[PDB]
C-alpha cells in the first residue's frame, strides 16, 4: 500500500525504460530529498536549469552538490512561492435585490 522508505536507487529501476530519470528528475530530487527545504519534487524542476551531466557531478561531490541545491532553497523559496494570484477580498457576495 503506502510507500515506506522512498528509495531513489530502486525508484529508478521501478519505472519503465524511458521512465528512467522521469520521476525523480535528473539527480536533484535525491539531493534535495536529503535536505527537503521547500519541496524535493518541485525543487528538482527548478534546478533542472542545467544539463543532466552537471547534476550527476554534484551528486557525486557535496561541494557542487550543496552549491546548486542550497541556491535552490533561496531562489525557489523566493521565485517558487505561493501563487498570490487569488481572488480579491473586495468581492460582492450579497446581491442588493428586493
Amino acid at each position: 500500500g503506502p510507500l515506506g522508505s522512498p528509495l531513489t536507487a530502486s525508484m529508478l529501476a521501478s519505472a519503465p525504460p524511458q521512465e528512467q530519470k522521469q520521476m525523480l528528475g535528473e539527480r536533484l530530487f535525491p539531493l534535495i530529498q536529503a535536505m527537503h527545504p521547500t519541496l524535493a519534487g518541485k525543487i528538482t524542476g527548478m534546478l533542472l536549469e542545467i544539463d543532466n551531466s552537471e547534476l550527476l557531478h554534484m551528486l557525486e561531490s557535496p561541494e557542487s552538490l550543496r552549491s546548486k541545491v542550497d541556491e535552490a532553497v533561496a531562489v525557489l523559496q523566493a521565485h517558487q512561492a505561493k501563487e498570490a494570484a487569488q481572488k480579491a477580498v473586495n468581492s460582492a457576495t450579497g446581491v442588493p435585490t428586493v
Binding site: 528528475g25 518541485k42 533542472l48 541556491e71 525557489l76 521565485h79
Partner: peptide
C-alpha cells in the same frame, strides 16, 4: 542584496536522461 541564485526557478522537472532512442 536581492541577487539571483545558481539554480534559478527554471521550468518543471522532467526525465533528464530521456534515453528512449532505439
Amino acid at each position: 542584496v536581492l541577487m539571483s541564485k545558481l539554480s534559478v526557478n527554471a521550468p518543471e522537472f522532467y526525465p533528464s536522461g530521456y534515453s528512449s532512442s532505439y
